[PDB]
Design a protein around this ligand. Structure first.
Ligand SMILES: [Mg+2]
Ligand SMILES: [Mg+2]
Ligand SMILES: [Mg+2]
Ligand SMILES: [Mg+2]
Ligand SMILES: [Mg+2]
Ligand SMILES: [Mg+2]
Ligand SMILES: [Mg+2]
Ligand SMILES: [Mg+2]
Ligand SMILES: [Mg+2]
Ligand SMILES: [Mg+2]
Ligand SMILES: [Mg+2]
Ligand SMILES: [Zn+2]
Lengths: 143, 103, 141, 63, 56, 145, 100, 82, 53
RNA sequence: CGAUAACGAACGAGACCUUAACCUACUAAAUAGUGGUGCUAGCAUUUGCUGGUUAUCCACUUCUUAGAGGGACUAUCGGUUUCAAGCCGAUGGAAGUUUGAGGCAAUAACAGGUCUGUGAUGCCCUUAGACGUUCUGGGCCGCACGCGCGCUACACUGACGGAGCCAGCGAGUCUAACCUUGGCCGAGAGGUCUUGGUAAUCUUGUGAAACUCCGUCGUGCUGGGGAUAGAGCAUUGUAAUUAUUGCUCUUCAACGAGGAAUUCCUAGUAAGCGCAAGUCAUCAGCUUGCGUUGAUUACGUCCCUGCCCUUUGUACACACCG
């Protein structure tokens, strides 16, 4: 019927597509991974250390599929949280800029996302061709 | 899971057990504050019951490995049978004895 | 052209506009199906309008709901009001008035805010306190 | 509380003294004929004078 | 090239300043207010006094 | 899924860096008992040592924990990015250190002694025992001693 | 030709009959026109303490200023454009014309 | 240095941290006759940690000892196979 | 000498003053009017600010 | 309302004005938004699903905005009361506590506060080794202690990690350099190159936090809490030492729900949770607002504390501090 990325739950599609990333093994992971903690407001680095670039990449892939175009400044706001400022009240603090810009560069290499007119990154037709195909694959799992 | 009988039927007879039937009020009497036993509304009885049930779950599931859900069940079971080991049953008879003291 | 009506449900700040037209029967919320609405508890809250009247009145119409404003649980209530009003608007225009009244009565018996928006609005904050009623602290010595 | 003041209760009884055969036991027709036949500066006050005049008429049907 | 918020608030403070000047020195002619009128090619300021012969 | 029979080699106590590290907890949180290593650093060493972080402290092999302590005591030679160390670009040596257990306490006393020896303002504030970061003292810390 | 009249006063009743007289004098000259777009009214609020000193109960006070802004788009040869803006200028109402 | 509280301690039992043969068959033999199985009951009757309780709970549910009712996070609700 | 009035006054409370009474405290800088808080309250009605609510 | 030597009014209350809630009724709109038709992308393949597109253009106003208006008046019914003013249920209704919330706010006062807001001010002082003005450096922040508004917490109704993911009020530069998108470098905080915006056009869907789903923790002053200390890297600024602020790593204290006392509060309210604005070169644990999530309890009374009134006594009347 033409199943798409919108027709499947956000959690399991991101998990399934990230596992597609771990098997494909072609992502150009940065090298400072497992030393960084990916937000200035965060307190620890990602507990699931051996992935989580693949998790982040799958997460960012769905976002450009939904929206028109994003930049890296938008993604830091999305992935930021409340920073416990000790004895002071909490505050929204943006995420680590390098993490978003590099995985956006990394997704350019595999050909999922492309540059856009009017600024930002846009899902390419290669991106709009395989994200549906995992979405077909991941939604028959319970059927 | 713990008893086969219907859960909301367990909840509905639990609050009927933990409604305090007679209760005391504060008349002054002069210096030493005096007690007078009066009767309770059915609305107040339901009102008291919900508060008595949930405070017991809260103080028992606090600083303790048990989650609040599994705590909330067991006093609701314990009250619906009626045991005097439920906090809501223990508070209920405690009010009635002070009311019984003042008739 | 094609038989179609347009309704809206509201909540505190959430508004959800719904396009109800004649179709094959798919009920989408922001381009995604109705079964995907994230807060898992209140998903079973948004089923209840079609679960009240039976799914048979949703075979021959297809539903699009577009949702903006408010918060998470406010968005859920605006969705359910929009589809309930949209269904009752569709039977008002095209189908007879008998089907409208049995549709309306079952909704209005179960829960009144499926068709009528809740009128509870925010109360303005007043100088001298954190809230609208609360004051900060009085101290005498 | 919804106790009406002098202005509502005084203008209405004056209005009934000189317009009793025109006006009726229905607030709506009442709220239309006052609007031409008297000057009230606000719509809210016109709605309360007409509402009390409708109330007084029902009292006049019985005694 | 200034925004409409600032532009309207500027003309308020312009009126307020020009009213204070007229009320301070033109007191002995019965100054009772001022009006300002922006117009293509000109701004016109209508002084309202009592001894109009004295202001001229 | 994975249930595992633990065996008789296990230790309720272990000694690294002259400190009685308790067993029975995860290795990264267990090594934070050792002064000069906190939760962040502790994760990185056990990551750089290629150990399974899911293990408890008392059951880890003899070679692995001595491998761990080498990465702690020569951090930047094993690709730690060295703004991650506590005492980097030091005042005499110029090089990036990372004091451990007793060094943290001993070296903290020493740089205090410079400010006391040159009679710098912060040193004189420490000698009186008052605050040094510019705090108000008219009400707070009242019953400090 | 695409000229555009924009009104930005604070007096609503002065502004409207200015705007009505633009659109009615347009229709004797029979011009096609985008009828007045009313942008959201913007409220300039200033919240100050009442007291000049700092004594008493902490009573605040909010002065506000409402600014109403409309635009009408017109296409016209030059002689009407010279005529329309030359007349119907009302005090406290700001008028400005932009072309294209 | 008066304090206006009393501040008694507690007993602080030592719940088991690694699983061995005596714990292993003990959970194997008495997870039946439990009508309701969760993390907290396993802590109280078997003296194991929440760590062990959560992992053992996952273990039984594929092979077969306990039937699930609800697989939400932070609260697992399990019944017996009769 | 040149040293007179030589300290910078580019920022801070010393750079701005009420356009009516040349005071430094309680200035109102919103919308660029720069009148002190007690002088604005005396001039708010004829500037165009009014009380409604 | 009623009683009735009183009738009839005035000010204050109320009315009024602002604001929030309703309007498929009117007037209209690429600076608001749908639907189509062009042009396309992906997936299916039947006759569909979801997007992208600014010169595809044609129509539309439901949702957005504000002009003019309408609408509620406790309407209708029942009950109870000199059967009156009213009150209490039910039905209808967008709305039935003054529809919600404010703005305004009498007579008579007070030795209340303000001469440090004023080029508002009388008098007194000072006026060239000045109590004027300016410059340099300190101080207002100093700490044995006693108080008063607050912030963070004492923990699994939780902490941490990943994933989802949604507001409203608003502010913003030109003869200046404010709000900043996007690309790149950097773990970060930040740097740099361009761009849009004098603004329903751009920042900006201000992708806010609580929250939700999966995971690690597993009753341990513990992965609770993050005070107090040590090293570096940046930013504002002429200047940051008595650390300006921000970031990293390390050190990781009290505190296990708090005595006598005491405060605020009746529904979108309390409480939780953030954001904008004001001050602002830099600095929010403050205030003014705004949304988000949303209870329990009551629909009474004069017991306590205040204030008002009546009767009464008075040798008081700068009035019991008589
Ligand atoms: Mg797209
Ligand atoms: Mg618990
Ligand atoms: Mg004071
Ligand atoms: Mg009744
Ligand atoms: Mg912590
Ligand atoms: Mg914001
Ligand atoms: Mg220390
Ligand atoms: Mg008390
Ligand atoms: Mg709060
Ligand atoms: Mg006597
Ligand atoms: Mg006398
Ligand atoms: Zn001034």
């Amino acid at each position: 019927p033409g199943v798409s990325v919108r027709d499947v739950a956000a959690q399991d599609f991101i998990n399934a597509y990230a596992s597609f990333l771990q098997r494909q093994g072609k992502l150009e992971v940065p090298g400072y991974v497992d030393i960084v903690k990916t937000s200035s407001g965060n307190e620890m680095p990602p507990q699931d250390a051996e992935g989580w670039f693949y998790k982040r990449a799958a997460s960012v892939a769905r976002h450009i599929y939904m929206r028109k175009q994003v930049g890296v400044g938008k993604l830091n706001k999305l992935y930021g949280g409340a920073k416990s400022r000790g004895v002071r009240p909490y505050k929204h603090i943006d995420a680590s800029g390098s993490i978003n810009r590099k995985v956006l560069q990394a997704l350019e290499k595999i050909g999922i996302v492309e540059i856009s007119p009017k600024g930002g990154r846009r899902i390419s037709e290669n991106g709009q061709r395989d994200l549906d195909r995992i979405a077909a694959q991941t939604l028959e799992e319970d059927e | 899971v713990l008893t086969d009988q219907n859960p909301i039927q367990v909840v509905v007879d639990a609050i009927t057990n933990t409604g305090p039937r007679e209760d005391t009020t504060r008349v002054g009497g002069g210096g030493a504050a005096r007690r007078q036993a009066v009767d309770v509304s059915p609305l107040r009885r339901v009102n008291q019951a919900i508060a008595l049930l949930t405070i017991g779950a809260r103080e028992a599931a606090f600083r303790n490995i048990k989650t609040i859900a599994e705590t909330l069940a067991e006093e609701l079971i314990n009250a619906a049978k009626g045991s005097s080991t439920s906090y809501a049953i223990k508070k209920k008879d405690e009010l009635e004895r002070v009311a019984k003291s003042n008739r | 052209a094609v038989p179609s009506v347009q309704t809206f449900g509201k909540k505190k700040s959430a508004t959800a506009v719904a396009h109800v037209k004649a179709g094959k029967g798919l009920i989408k919320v922001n381009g995604s199906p109705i079964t995907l609405v994230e807060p898992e508890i209140l998903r079973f809250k948004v089923y209840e309008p079609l679960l009240l009247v039976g799914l048979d009145k949703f075979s021959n119409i297809d539903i699009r709901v577009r949702v903006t404003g408010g918060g998470h649980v406010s968005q859920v209530y605006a969705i359910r009001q929009a589809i309930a009003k949209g269904l009752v608007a569709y039977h008002q225009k095209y189908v007879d008035e008998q089907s409208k009244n049995e549709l309306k009565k079952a909704f209005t018996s179960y829960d009144r805010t499926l068709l009528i928006a809740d009128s509870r609005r925010p109360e303005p904050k007043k100088f001298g306190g954190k809230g609208a009623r609360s004051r900060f602290q009085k101290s005498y010595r | 509380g919804r106790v009406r003041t002098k202005t509502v209760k005084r203008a209405s009884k004056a209005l009934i003294e000189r317009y009793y055969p025109k006006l009726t036991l229905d607030f709506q027709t009442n709220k239309r004929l006052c609007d031409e036949i008297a000057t009230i500066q606000s719509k809210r006050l016109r709605n309360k004078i007409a509402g009390y005049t409708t109330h007084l008429m029902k009292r006049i049907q019985k005694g | 090239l200034i925004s409409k918020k600032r532009k309207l608030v500027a003309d308020g403070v312009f009126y307020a300043e020009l009213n204070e000047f007229f009320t301070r020195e033109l007191a002995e002619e019965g100054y009772s207010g001022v009006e300002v009128r922006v117009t293509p090619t000109k701004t016109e300021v209508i002084i309202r006094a009592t001894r109009t012969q004295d202001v001229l | 899924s994975l249930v595992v029979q633990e065996q008789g080699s296990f230790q309720h106590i272990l000694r690294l860096l002259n400190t009685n590290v308790d067993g029975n907890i995860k290795i990264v949180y267990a090594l934070t008992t050792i002064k000069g290593v906190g939760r962040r650093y502790s994760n990185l060493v056990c990551k750089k040592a290629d150990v399974d972080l899911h293990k408890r402290a008392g059951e880890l092999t003899q070679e692995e924990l001595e491998r761990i302590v080498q990465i702690m005591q020569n951090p930047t030679h094993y690709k730690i990015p060295a703004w991650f160390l506590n005492r980097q670009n030091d005042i005499t040596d110029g090089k990036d250190y990372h004091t451990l257990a007793n060094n943290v306490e001993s070296k903290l006393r020493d740089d205090l002694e410079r400010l006391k020896k040159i009679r710098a303002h912060r040193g004189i504030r420490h000698f009186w025992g008052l605050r040094v970061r510019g705090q108000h003292t008219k009400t707070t810390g009242r019953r400090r001693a | 030709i695409k000229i555009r009249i924009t009104l930005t006063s604070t007096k609503v009743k002065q502004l409207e009959n200015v705007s009505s007289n633009i659109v009615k004098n347009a229709e004797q000259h029979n011009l096609v026109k985008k009828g007045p777009v009313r942008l959201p009214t913007k409220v300039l609020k200033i919240s100050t303490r009442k007291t000049p000193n700092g004594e008493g109960s902490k009573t605040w006070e909010t002065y506000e200023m409402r600014i109403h802004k409309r635009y009408i788009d017109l296409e016209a040869p030059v002689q009407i454009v010279k005529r329309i803006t030359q007349i119907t200028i009302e005090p406290g109402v700001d008028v400005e014309v932009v072309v294209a | 240095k008066k304090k206006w509280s009393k501040k008694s301690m507690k007993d602080r039992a030592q719940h088991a941290v690694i699983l061995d043969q005596e714990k292993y068959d003990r959970i194997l033999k008495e997870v039946p006759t439990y009508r309701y199985v969760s993390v907290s009951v396993l802590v109280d009757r078997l003296k194991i940690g929440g760590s062990l309780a959560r992992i053992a709970l996952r273990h039984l549910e594929k092979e077969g000892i306990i039937k699930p009712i609800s697989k939400h996070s932070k609260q697992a609700i399990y019944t017996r196979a009769t | 000498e040149n040293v007179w009035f030589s300290h910078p006054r580019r920022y801070g409370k010393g750079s701005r003053q009420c356009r009516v009474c040349s005071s430094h405290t309680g200035l109102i800088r919103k919308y660029g009017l720069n009148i002190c808080r007690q002088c604005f309250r005396e001039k708010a009605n004829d500037i165009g600010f009014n009380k409604f609510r």
